[PDB]
From Swiss-Prot, chain B:
Coiled coil: none annotated. The lineage of its organism: Eukaryota, Metazoa, Chordata, Craniata, Vertebrata. The gene is PSMD3. Residues 15-39 have a biased composition (Basic and acidic residues). Belongs to the proteasome subunit S3 family. Component of the 26S proteasome, a multiprotein complex involved in the ATP-dependent degradation of ubiquitinated proteins. This complex plays a key role in the maintenance of protein homeostasis by removing misfolded or damaged proteins, which could impair cellular functions, and by removing proteins whose functions are no longer required. Therefore, the proteasome participates in numerous cellular processes, including cell cycle progression, apoptosis, or DNA damage repair. It comes from Homo sapiens. The chain holds residues 487 to 525 of 534 of the full protein. Component of the 19S proteasome regulatory particle complex. The 26S proteasome consists of a 20S core particle (CP) and two 19S regulatory subunits (RP). The regulatory particle is made of a lid composed of 9 subunits including PSMD3, a base containing 6 ATPases and few additional components. Interacts with UBQLN1 (via ubiquitin-like domain). Interacts with ERCC6. Residues 14-39 are annotated as: Disordered. It comes from the Eukaryota. This is 26S proteasome non-ATPase regulatory subunit 3.
UniProtKB/Swiss-Prot annotation, chain C:
SMART domains: JAB_MPN. One of its GO terms (molecular function) is metal-dependent deubiquitinase activity. It holds the Pfam family RPN11_C. The modification Phosphothreonine is found at T235. Component of the 19S proteasome regulatory particle complex. The 26S proteasome consists of a 20S core particle (CP) and two 19S regulatory subunits (RP). The regulatory particle is made of a lid composed of 9 subunits including PSMD4, a base containing 6 ATPases and few additional components. Within the complex, PSMD4 interacts with subunit PSMD7 through their respective MPN domain. Interacts with TXNL1. This is 26S proteasome non-ATPase regulatory subunit 14. Residues 5-135 form the MPN domain. Component of the 26S proteasome, a multiprotein complex involved in the ATP-dependent degradation of ubiquitinated proteins. This complex plays a key role in the maintenance of protein homeostasis by removing misfolded or damaged proteins, which could impair cellular functions, and by removing proteins whose functions are no longer required. Therefore, the proteasome participates in numerous cellular processes, including cell cycle progression, apoptosis, or DNA damage repair. Zn(2+) binds at H82, H84, D95. Belongs to the peptidase M67A family. PSMD14 subfamily. The modification Phosphoserine is found at S119, S193. Its EC number is 3.4.19.-. It comes from Homo sapiens (Human). One of its GO terms (biological process) is response to ethanol.
From Swiss-Prot, chain D:
It comes from the Eukaryota. Component of the 19S proteasome regulatory particle complex. The 26S proteasome consists of a 20S core particle (CP) and two 19S regulatory subunits (RP). The regulatory particle is made of a lid composed of 9 subunits, a base containing 6 ATPases including PSMC4 and few additional components. Interacts with NR1I3. Interacts with PAAF1. Interacts with TRIM5. Interacts with ZFAND1. This is 26S proteasome regulatory subunit 6B. Component of the 26S proteasome, a multiprotein complex involved in the ATP-dependent degradation of ubiquitinated proteins. This complex plays a key role in the maintenance of protein homeostasis by removing misfolded or damaged proteins, which could impair cellular functions, and by removing proteins whose functions are no longer required. Therefore, the proteasome participates in numerous cellular processes, including cell cycle progression, apoptosis, or DNA damage repair. It is found in: Cytoplasm; Nucleus. The gene is PSMC4. The chain holds residues 39 to 70 of 418 of the full protein.
UniProtKB/Swiss-Prot annotation, chain E:
One of its GO terms (molecular function) is enzyme regulator activity. Component of the 19S proteasome regulatory particle complex. The 26S proteasome consists of a 20S core particle (CP) and two 19S regulatory subunits (RP). The regulatory particle is made of a lid composed of 9 subunits, a base containing 6 ATPases and few additional components including PSMD1. Interacts with ADRM1. Interacts with ZFAND1. The modification N6-acetyllysine is found at K401. Disulfide bonds: none annotated. PC repeats lie at residues 84-117, 122-155, 157-191, 192-226, 228-261, 262-297, 298-330, 332-366, 367-407, 410-442. Keywords: Acetylation, Phosphoprotein, Proteasome, Repeat. It comes from Homo sapiens. It comes from the Eukaryota. GO terms for cellular component: azurophil granule lumen; cytosol; extracellular region; membrane; nucleoplasm; nucleus; proteasome accessory complex; proteasome complex. The gene is PSMD1. GO terms for biological process: proteasome-mediated ubiquitin-dependent protein catabolic process; regulation of protein catabolic process. The lineage of its organism: Eukaryota, Metazoa, Chordata, Craniata, Vertebrata. This is 26S proteasome non-ATPase regulatory subunit 1. Belongs to the proteasome subunit S1 family.
């Protein structure tokens, strides 16, 4: 129950964090870089997270 | 009904504890927020 | 600098009223009390003025204080307030270019900012800045000796750090000593008449309401039978990614049956709480 | 070994009883 | 002589001068840790943290190098840290008689009298620190210096030092002048006056004073004087075990949150360490049923004071409290573990405080850091392998600019804690006679009040006790005996500063030689020497060695 309320008490904190874009991959290259386009936009190199 | 309600909670132990966030993740989020404060 | 938090109950009620009344502008007004000592100032009365942001004529506040002199206890001008609707309760340039004039009028910087929107029905949002200042680049403020006004409070929001001057201050807390008399006076805002407490509503809509609920329990039973019938091994995580549709088995149950019981039992109980004494 | 074990058993008994009486009222407070 | 016996048994002198001789002979400090902590130069907190830390680690040793290395940085912080520095000068020279008035010759108010009156007020604070639990001419000097005074910015330190010196004495006249000091109805003298009345009336049950202060506690408005009376109510009741029950009931049933915090401190302080279940019932319960955060924190703090007898149950109960939703309750849990096991390192406490440093709330990190500092004290890494791990974690967090300034402030005061007296004095609220050191208890109680006054928690020098067997055959003549040990000499391990770019157990120890209490059972008694201990050697301190 403590766990639950703690999560909810931290809920309004985590919801303060802004949103996350969606993207469509095309291909990747070396040194953990990936080419992804945004949907009506251009193509970005993105470094992948360690997970 | 009361007997079932009592018996529901007797087995499920080993629930560890609460996992709010990670210390590394929280520190990184705070550092990114502070660095983007001018931005 | 543990000298903040001067709030009083009637003041906050008048400020939520005044902010909620005219929402699409930055309203402003004056708040008066007594400078009881250096670390604490008590507020007793608060008032507003009409406007069409702009500073009030001194004549208005002068006659206001003039009649409040005989209206009960005397008053000292202890500061002022404004709103910032839908904002982060932060000091503006217009605010800061009159705050030092207020400081010239009275050194104790009261920079109360109130908001009705983020102040939700449960939690209320206030600030009262203390002349967020940048005179010298190697000093902050004079008292830095406690973590109550420095670390105990929550750290300020990120946007208030952005568009506000980063030398932030202030610690707003209700701090009115929890006056028990008005607390007990207010208490319940939803008490009814005692003779209303024995009412019975009526028996006809009780029965057709029961009839209405029985059909929805039948349909919930059908849905419940199907959902126990599927019994898929797809794992409950993947059961929770396909529950977004109309499927609500056991997702009502309680929401009618106790509503049934609290319909029935009180109608039962009040059926017998008016019998052996009424003849 | 003798005697003192009985006293320490009874000591942790009322200690445990204090925790038991505590757990109810803290549960009642934390729910609301 | 037998005529001079009364002075030898009652004046308490030779304990003080031989402790001084031990620390001035055994001065295993570190010059360079202050230089490491000097890196975080700022105009806000670092000066205060350093000046309390070096005083903590070099208490009573009269070492004038950490302040004599620089002067412009010494006076860089102003108007409260000069007061803290002249406070710390007393802890540097505590337990002395001669070099107290004479070393502050530069810091007389009437010798220079600059625009700053704060440095010239805390000299009396230093004097009260030096001669704490030692009455006499210090009392009369402070009374006469408080006979006439300026506005009360000079009277904070003088009042607190006067309360420090004449604390157990219960002198009438000092209480009389503190009465009119309190009835000034002034904020600045509130901290000056509310503390020292509880200081002087410790356990006296001077019921007139209680009635006067509780009547005063219902009309004033200054927060500072409310805190002063709040700790005075606690410090007037001591160890009665049954008498303050009406008092604690009255202070708990009142609506005033600061007075409820006072009530929690009273039920802590009149019930020193007692395993009274009936007290802990209502105390712990109102630790949860309460609403104000400060009184909740005080209530959960009181558990650490109340469990000296068997302090191993406190981790078991407060482990759950460390996972509470409220950061205030978690912080109180952390400091409760820190103060309950104020002594030998217990693995359960270290394990429970291991994740407590990682919470994203600054003040609960403060509590975790200081609790970690106090649980691991004088530990040679074989008692618990975590000693160097916490030392390097502290070293990591002091030089990080990303953490909150409060947390690093606690870290520098932790380095002050770890190396106290050259690792020779430690925090132990327990004697070897089954009795609690009253001055240690009151010092560690006042030390908890760093929320609201930083130099008020400077009152920790009453808690440090040396851990050293001392040998003395006659009244004054030092012997020359050096005995051995039986266990691993790695229990005798020192920090041994590195600054880098086959095992003997017969560690010979002279008369003023340090020893851990746990090592008191593994010492070698002097058998081949000309001396022999008259009393069997299992207690520390100083023990008779009859000569053959």
């Amino acid at each position: 129950l403590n766990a639950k309320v703690r999560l909810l008490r931290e809920e309004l904190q985590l919801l303060q964090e802004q949103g996350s874009y969606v993207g469509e991959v095309v291909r990747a290259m070396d040194k953990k870089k990936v080419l992804v386009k945004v949907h009506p936009e251009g193509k970005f190199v993105v470094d992948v997270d360690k997970n | 009904h009361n007997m079932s309600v009592k018996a529901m909670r007797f087995p499920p132990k080993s629930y560890n504890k609460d996992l709010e966030s990670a210390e590394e993740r929280r520190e990184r989020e705070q550092q990114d927020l502070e660095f983007a404060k001018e931005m | 600098t543990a000298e903040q938090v001067y709030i009083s109950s009637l003041a906050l009620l008048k400020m939520l009223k005044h902010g909620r009344a005219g929402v699409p502008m930055e309203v402003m007004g004056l708040m008066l009390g007594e400078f009881v000592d250096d670390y604490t100032v008590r507020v007793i009365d608060v008032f507003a003025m009409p406007q069409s942001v702009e500073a009030v004529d001194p004549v208005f506040q002068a006659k206001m204080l003039d009649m409040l002199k005989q209206t009960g206890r005397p008053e000292m001008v202890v500061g002022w307030y404004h709103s910032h609707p839908g904002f982060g309760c932060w000091l503006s340039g217009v605010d800061i270019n009159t705050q030092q004039s207020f400081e010239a009028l009275s050194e104790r910087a009261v920079a109360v900012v109130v908001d009705p929107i983020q102040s939700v029905k449960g939690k209320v949002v206030i600030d009262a800045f203390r002349l967020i200042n940048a005179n010298m680049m190697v000093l902050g403020h004079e008292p830095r000796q406690t973590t109550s006004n420095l670390g105990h409070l929550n750290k300020p929001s990120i946007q208030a750090l952005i568009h506000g001057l980063n030398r932030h201050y202030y610690s707003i807390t209700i701090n009115y000593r929890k006056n028990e008399l008005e607390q007990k006076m207010l208490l319940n805002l939803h008490k009814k008449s005692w003779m209303e407490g024995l009412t019975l509503q009526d028996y006809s809509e009780h029965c057709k309401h029961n009839e209405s609920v029985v059909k929805e329990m039948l349909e919930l039973a059908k849905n419940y039978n199907k959902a126990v019938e599927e019994e898929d091994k797809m794992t409950p995580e993947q059961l929770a990614i396909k529950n977004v549709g109309k499927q609500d088995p056991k997702r009502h149950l309680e929401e009618h049956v106790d509503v049934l019981m609290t319909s029935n039992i009180v109608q039962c109980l009040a059926a017998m709480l008016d019998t052996v004494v009424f003849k | 070994d003798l005697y003192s074990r009985y006293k320490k058993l009874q000591q942790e008994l009322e200690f445990l009883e204090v925790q038991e009486e505590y757990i109810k009222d803290e549960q009642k407070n934390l729910k609301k | 002589d037998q005529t001079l016996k009364m002075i030898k048994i009652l004046s308490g002198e030779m304990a003080i001068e031989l402790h001084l001789q031990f620390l001035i002979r055994n001065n295993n400090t570190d010059l360079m840790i202050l230089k490491n902590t000097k890196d975080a130069v700022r105009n806000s907190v670092c000066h205060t943290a350093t000046v309390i830390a070096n005083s903590f680690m070099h208490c009573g040793t009269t070492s004038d190098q950490f302040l004599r290395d620089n002067l412009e940085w010494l006076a860089r912080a102003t108007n409260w840290a000069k007061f803290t520095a002249t406070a710390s000068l007393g802890v540097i020279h505590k337990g002395h008689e001669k070099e107290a008035l004479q070393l502050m010759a530069t810091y007389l108010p009437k010798d220079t009298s600059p625009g700053s009156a704060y440095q010239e007020g805390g000299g009396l604070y230093a004097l009260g620190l030096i001669h704490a639990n030692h009455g006499g001419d210090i009392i009369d000097y402070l009374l006469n210096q408080l006979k006439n005074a300026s506005n009360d910015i000079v009277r904070h330190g003088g009042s607190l030092g006067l309360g420090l010196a004449a604390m157990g004495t219960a002198r009438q006249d000092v209480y009389d002048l503190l009465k009119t000091n309190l009835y000034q109805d002034d904020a600045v003298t509130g901290e000056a006056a509310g503390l020292a009345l509880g200081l002087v009336m410790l356990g006296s049950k001077n019921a007139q004073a209680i009635e006067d202060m509780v009547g005063y506690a219902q009309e004033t408005q200054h927060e500072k004087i409310l805190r002063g009376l709040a700790v005075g109510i606690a410090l007037v009741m001591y160890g009665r075990m049954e008498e303050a029950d009406a008092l604690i009931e009255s202070l708990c049933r009142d609506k005033d949150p600061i007075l409820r915090r006072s009530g929690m401190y009273t039920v802590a302080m009149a019930y020193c360490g007692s395993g009274n279940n009936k007290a802990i019932r209502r105390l712990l319960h109102v630790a949860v049923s309460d609403v104000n955060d400060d009184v909740r924190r005080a209530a959960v703090e009181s558990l650490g004071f109340i469990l000296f007898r068997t302090p191993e149950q406190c981790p078991s109960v407060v482990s759950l409290l460390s996972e509470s939703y409220n950061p205030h309750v978690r912080y109180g849990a952390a400091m409760a573990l820190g103060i309950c096991c104020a002594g030998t390192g217990n693995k359960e406490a270290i394990n429970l405080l291991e994740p407590m440093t990682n919470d994203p709330v600054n003040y609960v990190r403060q509590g975790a850091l200081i609790a970690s500092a106090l649980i691991m004290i004088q530990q040679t890494e074989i008692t618990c392998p975590k000693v160097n791990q916490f030392r390097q974690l502290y070293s990591k967090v002091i030089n990080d600019k990303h953490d909150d300034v409060m947390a690093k402030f606690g870290a520098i005061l932790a380095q002050g804690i770890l190396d106290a007296g050259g690792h020779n004095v430690t925090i132990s609220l327990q004697s070897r006679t089954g009795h609690t050191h009253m001055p240690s208890v009151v010092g560690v109680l006042v030390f908890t009040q760093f929320w609201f006054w930083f130099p008020l928690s400077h009152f920790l020098s009453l808690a440090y006790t040396p851990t050293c067997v001392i040998g003395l055959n006659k009244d004054l003549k030092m012997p020359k005996v050096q005995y051995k040990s039986n266990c691993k000499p790695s229990t005798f391990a020192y920090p041994a500063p590195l600054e880098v770019p086959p095992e003997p157990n017969f560690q010979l120890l002279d008369n003023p030689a340090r020893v851990m209490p746990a090592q008191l059972k593994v010492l070698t008694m002097p058998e081949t020497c000309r001396y022999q201990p008259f009393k069997p050697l299992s207690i520390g301190g100083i023990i008779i060695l009859k000569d053959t």
